[PDB]
Amino acid sequence: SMQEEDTFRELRIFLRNVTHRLAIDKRFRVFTKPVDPDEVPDYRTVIKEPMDLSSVISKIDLHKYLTVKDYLRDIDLICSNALEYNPDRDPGDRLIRHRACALRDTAYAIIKEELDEDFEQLCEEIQESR
Ligand SMILES: CC[C@]1(C(=O)NCc2ccccc2)CCN(C)CCN1
């Protein structure tokens, strides 16, 4: 229905605003663009499904996310990719792990304060109906 398309358009407006608030933070600059295979040729041999905040914006605009749950699985993949690629005790690895955990905690905290639980339940019911 038109009302169902209006529900998904509101979900996209909400997700683009959360994603842009993450992408302007200093702590998260390293997560804003894909890894340049020239600067890091090893990356795509270790990390099988790369993800970044620019790609998240592209996926919102392509109508890939019908629920906040499917958006948060891509925020989780940004975080887990950083933890797996940078696992050592050295300070550069520890700094990107701390930033990756802060990106995931920040996204979940914005969604906990600003997403109505009944709005997400409606999206999940339209998705399960299709
Ligand atoms: C220099 C580019 C910049 C940016 O806005 N890119 C757009 C963007 C928007 C949403 C998701 C990923 C990327 C400047 C803003 N910030 C300070 C730092 C991030 N990088």
Side-chain angles (χ1 to χ4, degrees), residues 1-25 27-130:
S1 66
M2 171 82 287
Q3 305 92 267
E4 287 169 348
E5 292 315 310
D6 288 347
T7 300
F8 294 133
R9 201 169 309 110
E10 178 162 355
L11 174 66
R12 297 191 300 272
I13 292 160
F14 176 73
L15 295 179
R16 291 195 195 82
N17 174 263
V18 175
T19 299
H20 280 289
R21 290 155 63 194
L22 302 169
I24 66 182
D25 191 294
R27 288 172 295 164
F28 308 152
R29 210 177 168 93
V30 66
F31 305 119
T32 60
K33 233 224 297 280
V35 175
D36 182 351
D38 295 346
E39 301 161 37
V40 193
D42 178 55
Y43 189 75
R44 266 161 204 79
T45 95
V46 180
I47 301 302
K48 298 310 177 193
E49 191 172 9
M51 191 50 64
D52 68 278
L53 300 172
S54 283
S55 300
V56 170
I57 293 291
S58 294
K59 292 185 64 168
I60 299 167
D61 289 350
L62 287 170
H63 306 197
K64 302 279 193 166
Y65 305 121
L66 275 73
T67 71
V68 184
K69 187 172 274 110
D70 286 359
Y71 169 88
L72 288 172
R73 289 183 236 277
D74 276 345
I75 300 304
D76 292 341
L77 180 58
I78 295 177
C79 180
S80 61
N81 289 348
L83 304 182
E84 292 166 3
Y85 191 71
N86 303 281
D88 291 341
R89 69 111 18 223
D90 64 280
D93 286 19
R94 282 182 173 162
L95 177 57
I96 196 166
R97 299 201 306 279
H98 191 268
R99 289 170 165 177
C101 289
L103 170 76
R104 180 190 74 217
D105 293 349
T106 299
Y108 280 78
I110 294 173
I111 285 157
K112 183 180 195 181
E113 290 194 313
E114 302 180 23
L115 170 66
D116 190 305
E117 61 187 50
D118 290 337
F119 181 86
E120 176 60 8
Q121 185 67 34
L122 176 57
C123 290
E124 285 181 24
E125 293 184 5
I126 306 167
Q127 173 182 66
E128 175 62 25
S129 94
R130 303 226 142 163

